[PDB]
Write a protein that binds this ligand. Structure first.
Ligand SMILES: [Ca+2]
Ligand SMILES: [Ca+2]
Ligand SMILES: [Ca+2]
Ligand SMILES: [Ca+2]
Lengths: 274, 274, 274, 274
C-alpha cells in the first residue's frame, strides 16, 4: 500500500483493471422491452451470470450471480430496485432463497435519487407486490450510527409461505468519495458475516447500492479477499487486483473509481488485522 | 394425404376441426383462486374431465383425463408445471398411479422458460415438495441423441411408499414449427410404448409440453390412431380427424396449428408402416 | 440412387472405393514419439498432407489438409483431441487461421469418451494451454434442437492477439448408424456455410469427429459435391464416388461404412434440391 | 454421546443409517471387464459420483467424488490401489489435480494384504506406470509415531510435466476395532489441513484405506462435521448422522461398523475442542 500511495500508482493500477476486464454479451439486458428495467444504460448484467426470474413472460432483472470458487462464497449483485422492479427484486430474493439483503446506499443521495423505497418503513404500512404476488412487512429494526438492520417478513402470497429476510443497511457512505476510514465499513461486514447471511445453507446474499457495481463491488471484493487471506496456507498469495478481475468476469464495472480501489485495499489491509 | 397436401387443404381441415370442437364449461379452472395455477388463459381443462387433486384446500391442477374407448388407452394431458405447481404435478402422478411422464419440450425454448424444473437434475440433490409431502429423487439418466430417459423415485413422505417413475424427455422438437420427419418422434413413441408406461396395468401416462395441447396432442393423437389402425380390420377407416375431435371432447385445443395437423397425419402414416 | 438402393450395391460400391483408395506413407505419424498423439492406430494422416505444427519440439498432430481443386474448398480433417493434444489442436486452428471448427460428435457416446473437453463449458472458466501458450474463452453459446453454435475467443498469450472462432457442434448424430434423414445434417451444413466459416478469406475449416474420417468425411464430401453440382453445368456429371476417392488422396478412410456411403449420396441428393 | 453409550444405542443408530442410506446404480463398476479393477465385490462407486479416468478405452476406477456443498469441501474416496490399478490410481490423481493423497491403512494388515505398494519406498527405486505413462519418485519422507508424510514427484511422461504430491500416511490404525483415542487421528487430520491439501485451489484430496469406505469415511465424516461446527452460526445444529447420510449419497457404505460410528462421534466431539 505504501509504494502505490507514494508513487501514486492508483489510477495506473485501476486503469489496468478496466483494460484487462473481461467482456461478455448482455444481449437480454439490451432488449428494447427491458430498457425501463435498467437503472443505468452503461450498467448491465452479462448474459451468462444474470439472475433469471422464474417466469415465462419476462425473466429479466438487472442482477448478477458472482461465484468465487476458491474463496467459496456466492453473491448476487444488483441495482437498487426501480419503482417498477420492486416486485422483481423481491421475487428474485425468494426464488434465489437469499437470507440477507445488503444495501449500501441511501434511497436519496445528493440531489438525485439512487434507489427506490422497496421495503416498508412502517410496521403497519406493509407492502404488496401484486405483479409478483408477494407481501413484505417490517417486523422490527435496529438503528445504529453507521448502519441499520431490519427484520422483514416476506410472504409468497401464492403459497402463503413466509421467510424472514435480514436487511443490512449501511447508511453512512458519503455522497462523494469513499469513507476516510474503512472502520465502520469493516464493522458492517462483520455484522453481515456474523448474521449468518453469507453462509452456504442460504441462497446468495443480495448486495446493492445504486448501479450495483461500485459500493457493492467493494463490499464483495473486501469480503472475498479477507476469506482468501484466511483460507490460504499463504498469508499474502492473495492479490486483490487479480481477485477483482476474477470478480469482473461475473458483473461488469465492479469498483467504479481509483478511490474505491484504494479504499478496497485499505479495507482488506485494515481488516486483515481482525 | 397427398391429395390434402396437393390441394393444400390442411388449414381448411384444421378450421373445420376448430369449428366442430366440442365446448364445455371450465368453471373451476377460471376461479380467481386458480389463476396462478394456469400457464395460459386460453388453455383450461373442462370441468368434466379435469384431474382432481386428492386435497381439500384446492383440488385444482390444469390437467385433463383423455379416455379413448375404442383404442383402449387413457392419457393425462397437462401443462408444463409452474414454479408453484410442481408439487401438485407430482401429487397427481402419485394419486393417479401413473408409471410414465412424457415431456415433449425443453425447459427453455425461444428464450422463454416454458416449464419449471420440476424434477431433480442431480442424483444427490433430491427434491422435496413440502406442500404435497413428496420426495423426488433422480435415480438414473440415459441421455440419447433425440431424447433422454430418466428413472426417478417418487416417495410419499407420509407413507414412505416409493414408486419408480420413468420420465421420457423428447428433447429435439424444434423451437419453431414441427419436425420435418416424424421418424425420431415415432421412435420416441415406440420407446415410450416399450417401457410399458402406457400399459393398462398403470394409471394414465402423464403427457405435457408448453400448454399441454399441441405437441402433447400430437403424441396422443398419433399413438391412438396407430392403436386403432392396428386394431381395426380396415386400417383405412381410421379417420384421424374424427379421432382428434373425439379427443377434443376431453381437453380443448388439441393440435394448435395446421402444420401440427399435417405432422400428425404423416406421423400416423409413417408410423402405420410401423 | 434407387438403382444402387434396389440392387443393394452400396457395399459393393464401398469396397471398390476401399480398393481404389490411394495409398501414401504415414511415416511421421507412426514414429514412436507420436504414438500418444494418435487416437486410433489405423487412422493416420499421410505425410504429404498432414498439418504441421509451427513448433520445433514436435510438429505432429493427427490432422490432414484436404484441398479440393474444382470445388475450390479446403478442409482440415482431424481426430477428436486427446487429453494431451488440446493445446496442439488450438495451435493448429490459430496457425492455420481457421475461422470455424465443426464438431460432429458428442463428448460421450456409447459410453466411451470419444473426445477431450477441448473447449471451455463455462464463460467464467477460460482454458489455458500452457504448452502452446494460448488462452481460450467461451464468449457465447446458442443451443438449438439439433446443434449448438458457440462463439469462442482464442488468444495468443505471447502476442495478445485475439480471434473469434465459431464452434459448430452438430449434437444429434445417433450413437449407432447414420441419420435416417439428412435434413437436420444439411441444415447444419447450410448453417455452417452461412457463418462464412468456409469462406476462402479464412484458413481451412477444422472438421472433426471420433477418428476424423467417418462423420467428418461425410460433412466435407457432401459439402464438396454440392459445390460441384451447383458449379458444374451438368449437375449429373458429379460423380461422388470420384469426389470421395479424390478426397481419399489427402486423408485415408474417409467414409467408414456402406451406410455412411449411402447417407452421403442421399445428403447430396436431398441437399441438391437445396 | 453420554446417553448413547449408556443406553447403548450405537448399533441402533448405525443400523438406522444403513437402512436410510441412498441407493444408486453402479452399472459401470459391475461390468464384467471391470471385475479385476474392484478390490471388493460389495464395494462399488455409484455411477453418478464415480471418477472417470480420461480415456476412451476404459475410464473405470473404483473411486467416488464426495462433494459436501455446505461444509464446502470435496474428497475423492477410493480403494487401496490394486497391482494392476496403480497407474489408474495415479492417472486419477493427475487428471483430478489432487495435491494430497491420504492413506489410512498399512499395505499389509493382519494376515491378509489390504492395499498395493503403489508408491516408491526408495528414492533411487522410482516407479514407471507404462500403462498410463506416469513416473513417480520418492523425494523425501518424514516418519513419525502415528503417521508418515512423503514428498512425491509425479510426472506426466507424455507431457514431461511434474507435480509434487504430499502423501499423508496414518500408519497406526489397529488391525481390529478403532483407536481407543481419536488423539493421533485428529492430529493427523490437522496436519493434512495445515498442509493445504484440502483447500479449493487444488483438486480434491484423494483418500483411501482398503475398500475406501470405513477408515476413509471416518476421516471425511470427521473433517466435514468439524467444518460445519465452525461454519455455522449455531454450534450444534450439525448432526453427524445426517451428515453421514448426505455423504453416503456419493459413496456407498461410508463407516462400516458401529464402532467406527462411535469413534467418528468421539473425534468430532474431542476435536471440536480444538
Ligand atoms: Ca452461468
Ligand atoms: Ca368425467
Ligand atoms: Ca502437400
Ligand atoms: Ca455427478
Amino acid at each position: 500500500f505504501e509504494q502505490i500511495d507514494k508513487s501514486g500508482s492508483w489510477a495506473a493500477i485501476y486503469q489496468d483493471i478496466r483494460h484487462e476486464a473481461s467482456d461478455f454479451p448482455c444481449r437480454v439486458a439490451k432488449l428494447p422491452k427491458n430498457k425501463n428495467r435498467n437503472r443505468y444504460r452503461d450498467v448491465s448484467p452479462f448474459d451468462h451470470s444474470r439472475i433469471k426470474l422464474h417466469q415465462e413472460d419476462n425473466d429479466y432483472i438487472n442482477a448478477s450471480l458472482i461465484k468465487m470458487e476458491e474463496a467459496q462464497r456466492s453473491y448476487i449483485l444488483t441495482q437498487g430496485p426501480l419503482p417498477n422492479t420492486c416486485g422483481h427484486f423481491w421475487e428474485m430474493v425468494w426464488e434465489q432463497k437469499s437470507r440477507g439483503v445488503v444495501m449500501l446506499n441511501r434511497v436519496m443521495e445528493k440531489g438525485s435519487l439512487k434507489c427506490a423505497q422497496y421495503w416498508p418503513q412502517k410496521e403497519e404500512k406493509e407492502m404488496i407486490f401484486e405483479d409478483t404476488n408477494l407481501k413484505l412487512t417490517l417486523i422490527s429494526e435496529d438503528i445504529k450510527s453507521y448502519y441499520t438492520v431490519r427484520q422483514l417478513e416476506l410472504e409468497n402470497l401464492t403459497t402463503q409461505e413466509t421467510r424472514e429476510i435480514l436487511h443490512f443497511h449501511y447508511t453512512t457512505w458519503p455522497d462523494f468519495g469513499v469513507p476516510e476510514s474503512p472502520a465502520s465499513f469493516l464493522n458492517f461486514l462483520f455484522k453481515v458475516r456474523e448474521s449468518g447471511s453469507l453462509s452456504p445453507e442460504h441462497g446468495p446474499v443480495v448486495v446493492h447500492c445504486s448501479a450495483g457495481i461500485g459500493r457493492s463491488g467493494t463490499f464483495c471484493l473486501a469480503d472475498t479477499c479477507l476469506l482468501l487471506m484466511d483460507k490460504r496456507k499463504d498469508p499474502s498469495s492473495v492479490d486483490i487486483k487479480k481477485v477483482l478481475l476474477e470478480m469482473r468476469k461475473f458483473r461488469m464495472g465492479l469498483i467504479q473509481t481509483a478511490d474505491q480501489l484504494r479504499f478496497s485495499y485499505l479495507a482488506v489491509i485494515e481488516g486483515a488485522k481482525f
